[PDB]
Amino acid sequence: NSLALSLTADQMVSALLDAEPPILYSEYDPTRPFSEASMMGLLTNLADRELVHMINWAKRVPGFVDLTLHDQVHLLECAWLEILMIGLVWRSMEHPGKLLFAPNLLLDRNQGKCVEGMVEIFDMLLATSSRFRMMNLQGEEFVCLKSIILLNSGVYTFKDHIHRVLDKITDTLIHLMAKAGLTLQQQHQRLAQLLLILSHIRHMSNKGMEHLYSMKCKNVVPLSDLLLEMLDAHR
Amino acid sequence: SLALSLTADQMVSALLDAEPPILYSEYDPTRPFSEASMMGLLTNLADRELVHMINWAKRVPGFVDLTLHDQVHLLECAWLEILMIGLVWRSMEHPGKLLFAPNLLLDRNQGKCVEGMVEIFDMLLATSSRFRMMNLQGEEFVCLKSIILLNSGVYTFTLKSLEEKDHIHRVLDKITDTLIHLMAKAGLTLQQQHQRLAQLLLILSHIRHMSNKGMEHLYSMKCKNVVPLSDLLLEMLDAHR
Amino acid sequence: KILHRLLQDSS
Amino acid sequence: HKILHRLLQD
Ligand SMILES: Oc1ccc(C(=C2CCCCCC2)c2ccc(O)cc2)cc1
Ligand SMILES: Oc1ccc(C(=C2CCCCCC2)c2ccc(O)cc2)cc1
Numbered sequence: 001n002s003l004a005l006s007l008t009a010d011q012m013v014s015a016l017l018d019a020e021p022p023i024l025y026s027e028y029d030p031t032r033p034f035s036e037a038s039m040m041g042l043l044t045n046l047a048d049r050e051l052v053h054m055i056n057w058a059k060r061v062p063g064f065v066d067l068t069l070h071d072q073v074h075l076l077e078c079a080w081l082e083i084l085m086i087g088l089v090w091r092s093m094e095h096p097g098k099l100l101f102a103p104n105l106l107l108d109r110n111q112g113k114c115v116e117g118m119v120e121i122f123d124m125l126l127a128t129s130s131r132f133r134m135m136n137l138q139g140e141e142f143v144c145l146k147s148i149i150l151l152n153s154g155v156y157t158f159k160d161h162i163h164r165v166l167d168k169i170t171d172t173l174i175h176l177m178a179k180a181g182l183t184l185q186q187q188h189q190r191l192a193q194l195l196l197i198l199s200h201i202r203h204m205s206n207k208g209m210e211h212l213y214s215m216k217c218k219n220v221v222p223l224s225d226l227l228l229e230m231l232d233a234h235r
Numbered sequence: 236s237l238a239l240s241l242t243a244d245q246m247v248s249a250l251l252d253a254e255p256p257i258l259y260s261e262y263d264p265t266r267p268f269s270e271a272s273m274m275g276l277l278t279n280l281a282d283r284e285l286v287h288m289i290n291w292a293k294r295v296p297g298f299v300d301l302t303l304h305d306q307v308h309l310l311e312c313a314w315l316e317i318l319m320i321g322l323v324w325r326s327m328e329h330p331g332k333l334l335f336a337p338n339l340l341l342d343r344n345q346g347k348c349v350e351g352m353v354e355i356f357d358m359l360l361a362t363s364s365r366f367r368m369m370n371l372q373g374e375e376f377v378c379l380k381s382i383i384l385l386n387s388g389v390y391t392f393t394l395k396s397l398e399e400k401d402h403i404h405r406v407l408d409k410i411t412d413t414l415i416h417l418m419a420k421a422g423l424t425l426q427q428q429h430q431r432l433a434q435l436l437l438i439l440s441h442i443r444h445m446s447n448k449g450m451e452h453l454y455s456m457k458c459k460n461v462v463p464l465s466d467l468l469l470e471m472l473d474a475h476r
Numbered sequence: 477k478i479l480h481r482l483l484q485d486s487s
Numbered sequence: 488h489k490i491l492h493r494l495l496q497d
Contacts, residue, residue: 206447
């Protein structure tokens with residue numbers, strides 16, 4: 001028996017907010033124009049350092065530590081790029097047209113054209129960021145969506161305890177909307193809109209996963225051993 | 236617009252009245268299974284299913300109020316998702332089996348006849364076991380299908396062209412109200428309504444994942460030049476790559 | 477496009 | 488053996 005189900009909705013928000021990973025920085029060489037290997041090398045280095053914090057963020061998600069080590073590995077292996085992308089989308093909220101990969105690394109659509117096939121994923125990420133901005137996504141809602149992605153994206157690729165925590169985060173999401181003054185009709189409508197965006201985040205992840213599989217086969221930008229493990233888990 | 240004034244009970248009536256039939260397959264039980272034969276059956280089946288889906292999409296409330304180019308985009312990105320959730324729906328009361336047609340029940344052993352398709356079979360089976368575990372209702376299933384039609388391509392899009400994007404969200408919120416009305420009649424508390432509403436929409440993330448995985452599998456067997464794809468399926472497949 | 481015709485097919 | 492195993496135990 002875990003302890004996530006016993007936590008209050010406010011105690012659920014505080015635990016997720018306190019587990020938030022930091023906003024990392026990219027390498028500080030000022031070269032605004034990028035090549036294909038230059039841009040992918042910076043993102044690969046950044047994503048590799050972000051995975052280490054995500055792994056420790058996952059351990060501090062209520063209910064995740066109560067899972068089997070294998071079940072913990074499975075959920076992170078399938079949702080890792082989704083979690084990175086929804087974090088990238090969230091940081092880019094107050095930067096329309098830009099993707100804030102790091103405070104010292106903002107990229108636009110023209111930047112994604114330096115890597116073939118990545119400008120298409122850029123538009124999807126920028127569209128999701130504009131969608132979060134349109135809905136006035138709160139940070140308390142964002143940390144709930146991240147933990148939902150972690151526990152849901154791989155729950156059918158195996159279970160009852162995971163759905164119990166997923167229902168707990170649902171109660172937590174409703175708690176936030178009822179506190180903001182939204183009516184009952186506005187609660188489940190905003191809840192639906194938020195969860196529907198997760199379908200696009202999954203889509204962007206699968207598209208991004210194939211893009212990284214293409215970069216591996218190009219064998220120009222060297223991937224880290226940890227990234228190769230998270231990448232090989234998708235075949 | 237007509238769809239905005241629909242009652243939730245009238246919304247269910249429209250979706251249920253528009254349900255496409257359950258087409259049969261050309262499967263011969265006397266013929267053993269093969270890779271080229273099995274994918275040939277499913278290609279012929281999915282191709283004839285596309286014709287009814289295109290006419291089913293027209294009868295979805297709000298879909299006719301969209302641009303002809305917007306209707307093409309929504310179907311191009313969601314066609315395999317809609318096929319898969321219908322397949323998962325038909326296979327709900329057949330554990331370990333996928334009911335592609337009333338005369339075509341496939342388990343995991345048949346899925347291995349095609350290289351790599353067994354992994355997608357397991358995901359579809361787990362989704363059906365999830366639908367069976369949740370005791371999914373037909374009124375909820377038809378709501379999820381129309382959501383997939385409007386949502387799967389709404390973020391892949393003239394400054395006024397986003398006004399129709401705003402109209403799609405109006406119908407999406409309208410279908411959300413319909414789901415909540417359905418669950419309230421089934422004796423579910425507000426907490427149970429929100430949880431079940433969340434569980435249903437979370438499955439759409441896996442349906443998208445299965446579609447992306449299935450879309451890459453169809454692209455691989457096309458370049459294999461082993462199973463010829465129909466002219467419409469080639470159009471739907473080229474729209475994803 | 478075939479999807480164009482079938483969507484455009486009124487009668 | 489996976490690096491992800493070690494990062495989850497440590
Ligand atoms: O915070 C981040 C979110 C996503 C990415 C990323 C993306 C790849 C998908 C294409 C669009 C760019 C986002 C990436 C880049 C390189 C890499 O080795 C692993 C992940 C990095 C950091
Ligand atoms: O109702 C159906 C749903 C999906 C499929 C299908 C699937 C492909 C994804 C892999 C798992 C099998 C299901 C398929 C097969 C061949 C084809 O040319 C187009 C679609 C057919 C009918």
